[PDB]
Nucleic acid binder design. Structure first.
Lengths: 129, 142, 158, 263
RNA sequence: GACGACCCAUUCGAACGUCUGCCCUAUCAACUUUCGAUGGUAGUCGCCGUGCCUACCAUGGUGACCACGGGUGACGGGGAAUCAGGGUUCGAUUCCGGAGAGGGAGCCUGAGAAACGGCUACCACAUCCAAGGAAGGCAGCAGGCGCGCAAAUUACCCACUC
RNA sequence: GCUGCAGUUAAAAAGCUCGUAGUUGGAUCUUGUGGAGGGUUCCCCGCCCCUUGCCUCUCGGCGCCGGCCCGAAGCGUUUACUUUGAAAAAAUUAGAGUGUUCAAAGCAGGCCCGAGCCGCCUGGAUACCGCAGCUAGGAAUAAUGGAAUAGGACCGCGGUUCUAUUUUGUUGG
């Protein structure tokens, strides 16, 4: 059965990007998916997006610009502390110059570079580059 | 292919690894202790024994020779061994009913080269080394 | 209730005495026994059934000879076939650091439960504090009982 | 086996603040049983041999003490491993000098010379209050002194002043907010500040918050707080550096700038 | 001034108890239980809490979240070797805690010992004898025999540290 | 082989289906304008609807000409997580100072006339110290909970039973 909705959303975008398609449809929608998409959009990796109401959790249509190399999920939501975050970005990123880990923290869902300014740890959700 | 990943799975992961280590051939013989009871040295690097008999063993094909060996009884267990004698003419130093120090042949209990079934070599005769006898530095005291 | 001297030796509270002088009461009467009880400290409250009751129990925190000190703990009531004692379950997660993952574990405690708590059931939540050794396996005594943060005894109207 | 009490001390097991060398020996002086705990004292031999340097060996210390030259709290002591400790006075009448034991801000006893009219009293922290037979009230201090008939306003955790010729109470300071204190244990050992809040727990330990002269803030368990003055002013003279605990970067910069240590 | 003694408080501890933490094994799946196992009431004994033990009564207590049983060339910890990141292997051994003086048991003296450079007996070794008797314990420092691949001098001193 | 292996044919998916413990489990329940530091909207104050969510005492200082105000306390449904305090032997390891002739080490050492200086200055840092227990902020994510055989609340009333034994001038009634 469907054990996790965020893993479907990112796998669906990742297969559409590799085929060269200009749009994709995500279903079911969730509060976690809308907040994750917003972090990719603010850094310039995807275009703007629209939500459809249907009285059953809803759907999203997203616009693609061709810049995204990958996006992905870490399935157990492991806890991270500021001293251990260096080991995770050494494992998951392609260079020290670009790409982002996404964390959930009591100050909100955010970019791993913002978590250092806000002096906060959290749980891992995923990444993009 | 299907490995479990859930955040409370540590008992399944830890105990499945523990169970599967017993299929590694090197791990098993080090931890059961049957190999330590079987080994004719009780975990030592060397042993002393007394020379029973001098013998020549036929080498395995595709080559042809008679390899000079000795049959030996160990002091601490009374069990029986056969051992190789290195270098040209060294069998003339050995005599019979006297002490040798013996060592492994270099492959951790397996046989070496064309010699069938020989696992050990001689290194010292009557408290003098075969190298010191062969290079003329010392002689057997009589 | 109406009788409590069920043992071969007479049962009474220490430190309470009954005068055998001025004994006249007429056509009626009043309690010949005053009741001893105490405050436990640590923000706990003494049950009404300890003050208004007539039971004898020397290991009771409110009306007997024990001092509450050291650790305060809680757990789930799971068995009660002994007399004046019960078994409670404590459940926890253990971290194994080679993996980044947890393991489920439990332990049992035998604890002393006095009268003044008389409607406890299997699956209730109970709070306990340390004592001196009270028997071979018993070191803790019940201070409070609750069924908050869970479903009712019978239907939701309870 | 251990069939009774021990009477030796290995040199790597000895308290860190004595600063003993690694290579002269296996043993260290076991402090004599007395008014101060083994972890919290300074044996008289370490003060005469290692700090003041009046003697080169333990035999040269023994023949200073047996001549009756050394007084502690105004009493002559002949024992070379006697456990001196915090707030005690040592007097050496033959050389004409007086000392008080106070912590350096790095958590070790400083040498601190004092004027002879300040060598007449000491400060004591209260440990216990109780009533004896015939209703007579008793007091106990941090250094095992027992006093009868204290003033009925003196409570737990307060500081009292005593004259050393008679051993009787002269004056006292209440434990309350705004008073000056010194820290006598933990990581904050040897710091000075004013008490600014007390936070309390029924069972387990109370915690006190303290404020520095430079405006830094620090905390510790209530058992580590010693009161030394009503309001802002201390009742004792204080050593060089006055408890301010500057950081390793500030200490580097003053050591380069002041050119001290014969630069 | 010196020495001494009943009682408080100190200092040095000792003893008993709380919470969490362990290597391999199912060709070990059920276990414990007036031969005290779990609990209650009164008592004895003890420095004191307690089935610690005795009388009477109840029928309990633990386990697939691995009990109970067996193995360990198993004394525990601070630590050591190797190591991109994560790990694997080792720790008899100078600091800290425990246990023991050929094997088991009993006890005197004392604040403190179930002590072995104290004592009494049995079990295993073994020395002297005028055959009646008497005496013994190096896993302290040197030194010897036996074992085995495998490990130093029957030297000088309280000058230093204590 | 947790990070990080493999199972059509090289070694390897129970003949097939049900099922208790174990592991895993769908969506949903309060936001934008204004000011500071910084930018050209977002992190701290105060607000559309609630900003510690409530509340009104009493032992106890403040502000002012009694009464009304602002710091404790009851406490915010219970936990994990995260960030911060406290408290944990030394030696070893990391790390600062210092020409043991260099180094491995050690904890020292450095100024000045001549001896008339009856000497002077200065070090013996600091970090790390899993888990479990203690402590104060944050509230996303993941557990957990309330009224359907209606109960929350008003300075709201009423019958009945128990009852401390205060205020009265006390000891007794």
């Amino acid at each position: 059965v469907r054990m996790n909705v965020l893993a479907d959303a990112l796998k669906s975008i990742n297969n559409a990007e590799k085929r060269g398609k200009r749009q994709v449809l995500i279903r079911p929608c969730s509060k976690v998916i809308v907040r994750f998409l917003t972090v990719m959009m603010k850094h310039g990796y995807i275009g703007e997006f629209e939500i459809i109401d249907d009285h059953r959790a809803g759907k999203i249509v997203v616009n693609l610009t061709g810049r995204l190399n990958k996006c992905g999920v870490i399935s157990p939501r492991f806890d991270v502390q500021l001293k251990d975050l260096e080991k995770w970005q050494n494992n998951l990123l392609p260079s020290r110059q670009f790409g982002f880990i996404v964390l959930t923290t009591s100050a909100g869902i955010m970019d791993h570079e913002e978590a250092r300014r806000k002096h906060t740890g959290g749980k891992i959700l995923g990444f993009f580059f | 292919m299907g490995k479990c990943r859930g955040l409370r799975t540590a008992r399944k992961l830890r105990s499945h690894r523990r169970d599967q280590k017993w299929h590694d051939k090197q791990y098993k013989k080090a931890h059961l202790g049957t190999a330590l009871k079987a080994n004719p040295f009780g975990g030592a690097s060397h042993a002393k024994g007394i020379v029973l008999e001098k013998v020549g063993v036929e080498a395995k094909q595709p080559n042809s020779a008679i390899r000079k060996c000795v049959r030996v009884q160990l002091i601490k267990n009374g069990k029986k061994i056969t051992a190789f004698v290195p270098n040209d003419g060294c069998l003339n130093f050995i005599e019979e009913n006297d002490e040798v120090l013996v060592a492994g042949f270099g492959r951790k209990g397996h046989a070496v080269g064309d010699i069938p079934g020989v696992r050990f070599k001689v290194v010292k005769v009557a408290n003098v080394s075969l190298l010191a006898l062969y290079k003329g530095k010392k002689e057997r005291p009589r | 209730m109406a009788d409590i001297q069920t043992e071969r030796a007479y049962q009474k509270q220490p430190t309470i005495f009954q005068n055998k002088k001025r004994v006249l009461l007429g056509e009626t009467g009043k309690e010949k026994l005053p009741r001893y009880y105490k405050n436990i400290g640590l923000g706990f409250k003494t049950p009404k059934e300890a003050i208004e009751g007539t039971y004898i129990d020397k290991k009771c925190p409110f009306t007997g000879n024990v001092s509450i000190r050291g650790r305060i703990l809680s757990g789930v009531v799971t068995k009660m076939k002994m007399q004046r004692t019960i078994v409670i379950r404590r459940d926890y997660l253990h971290y194994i650091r080679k993996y980044n993952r947890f393991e489920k574990r439990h332990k049992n405690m035998s604890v002393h439960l006095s009268p003044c708590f008389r409607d406890v059931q299997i699956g209730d939540i109970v709070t306990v504090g340390e004592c001196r050794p009270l028997s071979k396996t018993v070191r803790f005594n019940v201070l409070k009982v609750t069924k908050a943060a869970g479903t009712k005894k019978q239907f939701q109207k309870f | 086996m251990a069939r009774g009490p021990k009477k030796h001390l290995k040199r790597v097991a000895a308290p860190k603040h004595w600063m003993l060398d690694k290579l002269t020996s296996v043993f260290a002086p076991r402090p004599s049983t007395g008014p101060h705990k083994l972890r919290e004292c300074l044996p008289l031999i370490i003060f005469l041999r290692n700090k003041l340097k009046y003697a080169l060996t333990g035999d040269e210390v023994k023949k200073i003490c047996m001549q009756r030259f050394i007084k502690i709290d105004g009493k002559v002591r002949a024992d070379i491993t006697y456990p001196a400790g915090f707030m005690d006075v040592i007097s050496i009448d033959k050389t004409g000098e007086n000392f008080r034991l106070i912590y350096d801000t790095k958590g070790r006893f400083a040498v601190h010379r004092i004027t002879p009219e300040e060598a007449k009293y000491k400060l004591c922290k209260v440990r216990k209050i109780f009533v004896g037979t015939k209703g007579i009230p008793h007091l106990v201090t941090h250094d095992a002194r027992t006093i009868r008939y204290p003033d009925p306003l003196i409570k737990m955790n307060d500081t009292i002043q005593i004259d050393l010729e008679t051993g009787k109470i002269t004056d006292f300071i209440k434990f309350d907010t705004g008073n000056l204190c010194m820290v006598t244990g933990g990581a904050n050992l040897g710091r000075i500040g004013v008490i600014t809040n007390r936070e309390r727990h029924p069972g387990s330990f109370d915690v006190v918050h303290v404020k520095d002269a430079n405006g830094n803030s620090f905390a510790t368990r209530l058992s580590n707080i010693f009161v030394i003055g009503k309001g802002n002013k201390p009742w004792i003279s204080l050593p060089r550096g006055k408890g301010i605990r500057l950081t390793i970067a500030e200490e580097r910069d003053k050591r380069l700038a002041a050119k001290q240590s014969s630069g």
